[PDB]
Amino acid sequence: STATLCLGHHAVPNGTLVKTITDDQIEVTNATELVQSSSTGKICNNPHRILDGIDCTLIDALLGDPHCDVFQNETWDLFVERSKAFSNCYPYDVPDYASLRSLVASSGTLEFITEGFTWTGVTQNGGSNACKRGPGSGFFSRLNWLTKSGSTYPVLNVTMPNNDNFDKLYIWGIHHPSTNQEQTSLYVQASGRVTVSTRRSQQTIIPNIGSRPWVRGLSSRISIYWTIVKPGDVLVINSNGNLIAPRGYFKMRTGKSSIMRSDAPIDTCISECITPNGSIPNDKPFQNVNKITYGACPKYVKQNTLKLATGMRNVPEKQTQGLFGAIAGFIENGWEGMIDGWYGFRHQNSEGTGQAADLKSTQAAIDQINGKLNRVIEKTNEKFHQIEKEFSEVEGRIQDLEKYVEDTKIDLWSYNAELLVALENQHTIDLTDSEMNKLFEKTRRQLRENAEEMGNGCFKIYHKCDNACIESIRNGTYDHDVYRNEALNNRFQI
Amino acid sequence: STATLCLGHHAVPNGTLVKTITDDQIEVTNATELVQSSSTGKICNNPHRILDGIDCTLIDALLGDPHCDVFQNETWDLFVERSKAFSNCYPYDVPDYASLRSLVASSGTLEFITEGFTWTGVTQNGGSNACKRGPGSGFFSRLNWLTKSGSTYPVLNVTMPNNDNFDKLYIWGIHHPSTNQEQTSLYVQASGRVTVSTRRSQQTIIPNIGSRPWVRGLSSRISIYWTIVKPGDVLVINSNGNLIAPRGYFKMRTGKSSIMRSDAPIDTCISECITPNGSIPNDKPFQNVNKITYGACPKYVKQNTLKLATGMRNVPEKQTQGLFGAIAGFIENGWEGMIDGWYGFRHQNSEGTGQAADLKSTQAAIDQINGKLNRVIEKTNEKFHQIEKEFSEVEGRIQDLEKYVEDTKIDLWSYNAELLVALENQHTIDLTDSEMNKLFEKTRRQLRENAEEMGNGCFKIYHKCDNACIESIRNGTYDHDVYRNEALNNRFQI
Amino acid sequence: STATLCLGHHAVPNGTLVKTITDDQIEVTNATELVQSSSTGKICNNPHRILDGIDCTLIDALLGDPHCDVFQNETWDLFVERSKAFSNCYPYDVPDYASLRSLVASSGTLEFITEGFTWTGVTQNGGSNACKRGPGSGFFSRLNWLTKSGSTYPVLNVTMPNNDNFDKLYIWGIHHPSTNQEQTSLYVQASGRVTVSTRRSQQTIIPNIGSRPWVRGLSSRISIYWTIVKPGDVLVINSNGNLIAPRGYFKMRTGKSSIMRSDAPIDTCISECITPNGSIPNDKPFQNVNKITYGACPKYVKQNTLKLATGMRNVPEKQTQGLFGAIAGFIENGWEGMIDGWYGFRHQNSEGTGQAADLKSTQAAIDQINGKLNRVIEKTNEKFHQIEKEFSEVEGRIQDLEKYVEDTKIDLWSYNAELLVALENQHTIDLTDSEMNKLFEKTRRQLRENAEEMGNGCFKIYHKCDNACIESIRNGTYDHDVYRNEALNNRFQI
Numbered sequence A, B, C: 001s002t003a004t005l006c007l008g009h010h011a012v013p014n015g016t017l018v019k020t021i022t023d024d025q026i027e028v029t030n031a032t033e034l035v036q037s038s039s040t041g042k043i044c045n046n047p048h049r050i051l052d053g054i055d056c057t058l059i060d061a062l063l064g065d066p067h068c069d070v071f072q073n074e075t076w077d078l079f080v081e082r083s084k085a086f087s088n089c090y091p092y093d094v095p096d097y098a099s100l101r102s103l104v105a106s107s108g109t110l111e112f113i114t115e116g117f118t119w120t121g122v123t124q125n126g127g128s129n130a131c132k133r134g135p136g137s138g139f140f141s142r143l144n145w146l147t148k149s150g151s152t153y154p155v156l157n158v159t160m161p162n163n164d165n166f167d168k169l170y171i172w173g174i175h176h177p178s179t180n181q182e183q184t185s186l187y188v189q190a191s192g193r194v195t196v197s198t199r200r201s202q203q204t205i206i207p208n209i210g211s212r213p214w215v216r217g218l219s220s221r222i223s224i225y226w227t228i229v230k231p232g233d234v235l236v237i238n239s240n241g242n243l244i245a246p247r248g249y250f251k252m253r254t255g256k257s258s259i260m261r262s263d264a265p266i267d268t269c270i271s272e273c274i275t276p277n278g279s280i281p282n283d284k285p286f287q288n289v290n291k292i293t294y295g296a297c298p299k300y301v302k303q304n305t306l307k308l309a310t311g312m313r314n315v316p317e318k319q320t321q322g323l324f325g326a327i328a329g330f331i332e333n334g335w336e337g338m339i340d341g342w343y344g345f346r347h348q349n350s351e352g353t354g355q356a357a358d359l360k361s362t363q364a365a366i367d368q369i370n371g372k373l374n375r376v377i378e379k380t381n382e383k384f385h386q387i388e389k390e391f392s393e394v395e396g397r398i399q400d401l402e403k404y405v406e407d408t409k410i411d412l413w414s415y416n417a418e419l420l421v422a423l424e425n426q427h428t429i430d431l432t433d434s435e436m437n438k439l440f441e442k443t444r445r446q447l448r449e450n451a452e453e454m455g456n457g458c459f460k461i462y463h464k465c466d467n468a469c470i471e472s473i474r475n476g477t478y479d480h481d482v483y484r485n486e487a488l489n490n491r492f493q494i
């Protein structure tokens, strides 16, 4: 007399839990991770030029420490400073080291151009055993130590014009004697002085005499300062003692260059994202590996996981199992048997019982889901030279702000990630339920007065509906007028 | 025997594409831009007091450079520093220039109050040809150059009590001789010294001697320093040479004042938002003109566009055209013919065929949409003195942080904008579909057992329904019992 | 012949207004506040160790001002600096005071360990009447004033090795004479000098002579500087005059410690969150009390209120009253009579009329709502030492950035709060309407061809349905085949 046609949605045996706007742990038939939590441990030397510092820091490579001149005129996309690095040359100090380290790092080059300063009344090339270069004493390859010639130290007053169309970064210094005795014996005057200026900037450092800790055989020091000279501008160096003169300039640039402190072994491979932990794939939108990055990278978040639903809910409402073949619809059950689709049909008629998935709805759900997927991982976000976020020394005010800006950022992005994943998951679940409900309605209208909703997601079709008939319903060509009469009779009184 | 009544929604010929949670390019019947991408090129001198610096910087106007004293006692809401600006006076330098430039800018005033310092043992008014004021040599109108009287320079020790109920900003300085010869001939002592203090703060600067680049006929310089004196507090100035004494104080304030570097021509007009590019209308929530702003402004984002749907989807599912007059509902088609509403009806009956839009639903959709519109552009956000985001010089650490804070902000707001627009557009589309579906249901219940859903968004009304009848359905007064019998007969067997 | 069964949802007399994606003021049956707007006015000394500074600042407690030595070796989780605090000891100044104040505050301890410096050629314990300790002159308990012995001041050159496995924070200083006369009479040399170094850092301060304002009977000052010495590292102090020597070191730590400027009375109570205004309950996600906080606290936002809907909409569409007992469903009216549930039924049949709420839907709505509630207030967010956000002095550049970072944050979180509340409220309203609509559908399917939707949210059940029958429908056991015939007859022609 009649037939049965249930509408349904697939379900899987082993599903996944995800967060939403109302349920923290709600099961879906699938999910993709959004937080990269692991690194390979090795820094890929492609596609960014990785200049491993090894035993050198950027500053030592800059200054010309004897064990670092292998980096002379080096360039890099990312300079990697090793923790084992050490300095073996004249014990010096760089006031505002961080800034110098930062500005050179970003320049991405130690391209030094010797200029030819004529120092009359002293004659260059001082050297120390602390900076043993080769067989005997040496000094920073880029700095020029000037002492006394004969028995005097004429007031040095030289200039160097920047006729070039680029910024010149002059690195110079001043010597801090251990004793007034050392001061005099080297620079004659009781107390020397150094003043490096351009038309717009000036700096006059006074050598301070005193006994520091013994480092590499000395109690005296060298303070490092720098001076950038713009095009047209000129550089004047005046001094009456203690001048650790520059030998030229370092050509300055701007680019994607930066510097990273890491102990990760550099390796031959490709990876756009670099963290001190090693390279990390930037396929996912967020990462929990490190907040220090370089290259196209996933945003750092505090979360070690954020699963994005890429499927509908699993076996409706949820939990375990039961029932059997009487044919039930999409109400409180999904079909673990439908692997050939997401949504579909199951009929029980004259010819028996079977199932056929509806690719239309299956595709739409799948499509919309890939639509949000691409959107969620469509961005890249390249970040190169940024701020430091780990610090060796207590500094106070500037560090607190540097630490506060990042935490502030990290927290804002974690929330962004948490909310996005929830909104997206809520949407995906509604979107999938919607596709299902849509199919049921589409079939509901096709059947007209020839069938009744059995409340279980199935329609009781009040007329002989063999497989060919069941098919027509599935492929939208079901002509209801054809069976209207029989159904109207079977329905309204048997 | 019967009649037909379809439910529908309008559609337009030329529609717009917008982003959503699943589709990046989905067409709607309308959209409003959210990102202001263009500026007029001129800065409106209303409603903010625009003080054009012209050939002056704030610092030169402060100090009293001869070509800037036209700004004496000036006030402003926004000081606009021109790129052509130049200094024509004593070659000086302001350590922490930026801060002085910032703190004066925010004070918004150069209201100078001469105090009457008695300098015994020297006698004021030094002047230089580099600072040619009028016919002969001059000097910063606000600074007082003190040299030597007779043949000595008594240790200057004066004080100035802040009995006023406001902060006094004292701008003073120190002279840096080119040669010890110049030092002595001006201040007698081999080396002078300057110390400006209050009960809580102190600063002792030592004049450093040396040859700088020749600027305006000199190799010597003047360093500028400042001292703010709180109420009750007092200012003591001690020196034994090189003192470029202050002439009084600048009254300090707090307000909405700031300073902007721009080359935009100032123009007579009204506009709350100012960018270096020129004023921009702040009617939209975001802007892509510049991250440097002043006044009620749209938040800066990296996006040059963000369209906000202000209409439903266009001609259902989408693309091109076809079919004709057989009367179809809101299913896969919208009505380009319904310009008198958003939703409505179309019937085919005894008297012929026609259309009538339903203002109820039309208004609701329109209302909700304007509701979100107002919300989206209800805020103002006035921001006045902020941080600098463009820098002429390489500085390192502080610049990296200043650059990092803004990028961090800019990226967070771009995401905010991107997500908001998507959520809003997803909502608007659901909201509109909902209004439509609601109408169909309302009509569905009105018709009771007298009609059947033809699956195309139309109802086949199984009874004679002339236009007057069609009207009653449209205006909720359709009494179904009246035609129940005829419909029940026509339906359940003809 | 028939019966009536309406589906409905409760409503309350006095409801609340909340924001959503389309309506700013839409009424719901309930809402929970999200913004903590009030503080008790007292700081709870539990669970954070509150060290009230009273008349002392951290720096004075550090240095050893006579009226502060009650804080010797103090520890704290939060040091509270009182506005009444004052200094009564040698008039000094701390260059970069803020940083010292910050780094000690975070250390959370003033655990001083005297080291035993041998000062040969001078002999310690200088004292002043400005720092009257007890009966006569005294000095900072942690600083050691060294003058001249006999008639000379030997070049002090001592060292102190950090053999300890922790950072040592040495606080030292230099004396600034009022007159060269005072300089000589105390330190012999025309001009002394101080240089404190470690193997990696150095600082050489030169005593600057001059007359400052008279403070506590003096015109001379003491500048404070500090030096942190790492493990293995060593500290060398060299000087030829003006050395205000340290007496040992302060053991350095890292932790949750911080410092807060407040005038709130400390009180015995428990509260994780501290604001200068006094403790505040951190049960709510956001707070509008102050942007300065310590402990697990609600995020600061500019909003003084953000209500989170914790109930469905009130009496449908909205406004006032009317109608009566004819029995209407959930369409444009809610039932103020249903206090025993959120959703439910009302029937009119043979036995009369009554109401019975449906706990199934009632529970689901309630559940989902508590689900989002917990999520909304599931986080804690502990923040300890952060940046300062209120400043006593004009500083410029660093303050602008510090001010800009916070405003930037505050604005981003206000938006986050505004959007979250709207999304959540939109969700809650849909979620509740959905539960209602779901119930109606569930009943719709149960009734099959035995009833018709009266369009008012009620079903006209075309068959004798006494209370026992009405019950079966309510508890899902309604067998429709039983009354199918009678209904089919009553329906399709009476």
Ligand SMILES: *[C@@H]1O[C@H](CO)[C@@H](O[C@@H]2O[C@H](CO)[C@@H](O[C@@H]3O[C@H](CO)[C@@H](O)[C@H](O)[C@@H]3O)[C@H](O)[C@H]2NC(C)=O)[C@H](O)[C@H]1NC(C)=O
Pocket: A030, A031, A032, A310
């Ligand atoms: C379960 O969830 C995961 C994640 O959504 C699904 O895996 C993803 O499946 C898609 C399509 O099968 C894969 O797309 C591939 O893209 C590359 C792009 O270069 C292309 O070369 C391949 O031909 C293919 O189109 C995708 O890579 C894969 N993984 C991820 C992380 O997205 C999986 O299919 C889901 N479904 C089930 C039933 O488990």
Ligand SMILES: *[C@@H]1O[C@H](CO)[C@@H](O[C@@H]2O[C@H](CO)[C@@H](O[C@@H]3O[C@H](CO)[C@@H](O)[C@H](O)[C@@H]3O)[C@H](O)[C@H]2NC(C)=O)[C@H](O)[C@H]1NC(C)=O
Pocket: A157, A158, A159, A236, B178, B179, B211, B212, B213, B214, B217, B219
């Ligand atoms: C220290 O070094 C400078 C140069 O490095 C010595 O020379 C002076 O340098 C400036 C440029 O830096 C010259 O300026 C020019 O002056 C002429 C004067 O006729 C003017 O026409 C040009 O437009 C330009 O301004 C200056 O002439 C030059 N020579 C002298 C004698 O000053 C400087 O003399 C050295 N020593 C001292 C104590 O300054």
Ligand SMILES: *[C@@H]1O[C@H](CO)[C@@H](O[C@@H]2O[C@H](CO)[C@@H](O[C@@H]3O[C@H](CO)[C@@H](O)[C@H](O)[C@@H]3O)[C@H](O)[C@H]2NC(C)=O)[C@H](O)[C@H]1NC(C)=O
Pocket: B030, B031, B032, B310
């Ligand atoms: C297409 O989309 C645009 C943007 O939503 C619509 O334009 C907007 O239409 C409204 C109402 O017609 C305009 O409102 C006006 O507001 C001012 C406020 O001072 C008032 O004086 C006017 O009387 C009017 O109420 C609004 O200005 C206008 N533009 C924008 C940017 O919102 C347009 O109506 C949409 N509809 C169609 C069919 O194109």
Ligand SMILES: *[C@@H]1O[C@H](CO)[C@@H](O[C@@H]2O[C@H](CO)[C@@H](O[C@@H]3O[C@H](CO)[C@@H](O)[C@H](O)[C@@H]3O)[C@H](O)[C@H]2NC(C)=O)[C@H](O)[C@H]1NC(C)=O
Pocket: B157, B158, B159, B236, C178, C179, C211, C212, C213, C214, C217, C219
């Ligand atoms: C340099 O200038 C100061 C004033 O600008 C010279 O005078 C001394 O200044 C202070 C106030 O700045 C006076 O303080 C007062 O002292 C009296 C002593 O009876 C006391 O009763 C008041 O409560 C207040 O503290 C101080 O008296 C005043 N006069 C002298 C002779 O010191 C200062 O003398 C100048 N030169 C030097 C080398 O300080």
Ligand SMILES: *[C@@H]1O[C@H](CO)[C@@H](O[C@@H]2O[C@H](CO)[C@@H](O[C@@H]3O[C@H](CO)[C@@H](O)[C@H](O)[C@@H]3O)[C@H](O)[C@H]2NC(C)=O)[C@H](O)[C@H]1NC(C)=O
Pocket: C030, C031, C032, C310
């Ligand atoms: C109206 O809205 C408010 C806010 O949602 C509702 O008040 C809240 O009601 C719940 C359940 O009655 C209370 O839960 C309590 O939690 C504590 C946790 O320690 C537990 O000890 C209690 O036994 C109980 O489970 C909750 O505290 C209370 N307040 C808040 C701020 O959530 C109220 O019930 C809503 N309903 C109506 C009809 O007014």
Ligand SMILES: *[C@@H]1O[C@H](CO)[C@@H](O[C@@H]2O[C@H](CO)[C@@H](O[C@@H]3O[C@H](CO)[C@@H](O)[C@H](O)[C@@H]3O)[C@H](O)[C@H]2NC(C)=O)[C@H](O)[C@H]1NC(C)=O
Pocket: A178, A179, A211, A212, A213, A214, A217, A219, C157, C158, C159, C236
């Ligand atoms: C100022 O103080 C230092 C110590 O505080 C005086 O002594 C010198 O201090 C350094 C360590 O700080 C000693 O270094 C050691 O040198 C020996 C040399 O045989 C070497 O084998 C060790 O490995 C270590 O490097 C140094 O010997 C020590 N003694 C002397 C005589 O220099 C310093 O002399 C004082 N005065 C001056 C002007 O430096």
Ligand SMILES: *[C@@H]1O[C@H](CO)[C@@H](O[C@@H]2O[C@H](CO)[C@@H](O[C@H]3O[C@H](CO)[C@@H](O)[C@H](O)[C@@H]3O)[C@H](O)[C@H]2NC(C)=O)[C@H](O)[C@H]1NC(C)=O
Pocket: A037, A038, A039, A276, A277, A288, A289, A290
């Ligand atoms: C990426 O590098 C991070 C450090 O730069 C690392 O963080 C820290 O890693 C150490 C271990 O390498 C953790 O401490 C270790 O020791 C304690 C005591 O045994 C254990 O409880 C820890 O689990 C661990 O073994 C730090 O707690 C850890 N945390 C932080 C905030 O630095 C990251 O874990 C690295 N991430 C990846 C994905 O490689």
Ligand SMILES: *[C@@H]1O[C@H](CO)[C@@H](O[C@@H]2O[C@H](CO)[C@@H](O[C@H]3O[C@H](CO)[C@@H](O)[C@H](O)[C@@H]3O)[C@H](O)[C@H]2NC(C)=O)[C@H](O)[C@H]1NC(C)=O
Pocket: B037, B038, B039, B276, B277, B288, B289, B290
């Ligand atoms: C507002 O002012 C911005 C600068 O303060 C401006 O940005 C920069 O504008 C220049 C052109 O004025 C662009 O460079 C030009 O030259 C290259 C090579 O010919 C062209 O490819 C560019 O299209 C352009 O002609 C900079 O690339 C541009 N970008 C940035 C980040 O500064 C804004 O464009 C101005 N915005 C508005 C709305 O006026």
Ligand SMILES: *[C@@H]1O[C@H](CO)[C@@H](O[C@@H]2O[C@H](CO)[C@@H](O[C@H]3O[C@H](CO)[C@@H](O)[C@H](O)[C@@H]3O)[C@H](O)[C@H]2NC(C)=O)[C@H](O)[C@H]1NC(C)=O
Pocket: C037, C038, C039, C276, C277, C288, C289, C290
């Ligand atoms: C927490 O402490 C805040 C200050 O640290 C406080 O803010 C400021 O509070 C004062 C009053 O204590 C307000 O000014 C007063 O005076 C004017 C003129 O009579 C009135 O218009 C004000 O209403 C008030 O009486 C400041 O305007 C106020 N605002 C700000 C931004 O500082 C907070 O109000 C305190 N909050 C709580 C919850 O205790």
Ligand SMILES: *[C@@H]1O[C@H](CO)[C@@H](O)[C@H](O)[C@H]1NC(C)=O
Pocket: A013, A014, A015
């Ligand atoms: C199903 O879920 C997980 C995923 O593998 C697993 O722990 C569980 O054991 C699976 N079920 C069975 C029966 O293995």
Ligand SMILES: *[C@@H]1O[C@H](CO)[C@@H](O)[C@H](O)[C@H]1NC(C)=O
Pocket: B013, B014, B015
């Ligand atoms: C419709 O869409 C755009 C908007 O004007 C335009 O490019 C297109 O040509 C329009 N269609 C026709 C036929 O002009």
Ligand SMILES: *[C@@H]1O[C@H](CO)[C@@H](O)[C@H](O)[C@H]1NC(C)=O
Pocket: C013, C014, C015
């Ligand atoms: C209902 O709403 C508020 C909440 O108490 C109140 O202002 C109003 O007066 C209440 N209605 C009556 C009749 O009291």
Ligand SMILES: *[C@H]1O[C@H](CO)[C@@H](O)[C@H](O)[C@H]1NC(C)=O
Pocket: A072, A073, A111, A112, A113, A114
């Ligand atoms: C390095 O670069 C400079 C300038 O390009 C060049 O003159 C010099 O010879 C090079 N030296 C080395 C070691 O590469």
Ligand SMILES: *[C@H]1O[C@H](CO)[C@@H](O)[C@H](O)[C@H]1NC(C)=O
Pocket: B072, B073, B111, B112, B113, B114
């Ligand atoms: C400027 O302001 C001061 C103080 O208000 C006043 O005494 C002085 O005369 C004014 N001078 C000019 C040029 O405006």
Ligand SMILES: *[C@H]1O[C@H](CO)[C@@H](O)[C@H](O)[C@H]1NC(C)=O
Pocket: C072, C073, C111, C112, C113, C114
């Ligand atoms: C303070 O702490 C130090 C080191 O722990 C200890 O030697 C000293 O005696 C203590 N003094 C006081 C006043 O607590």
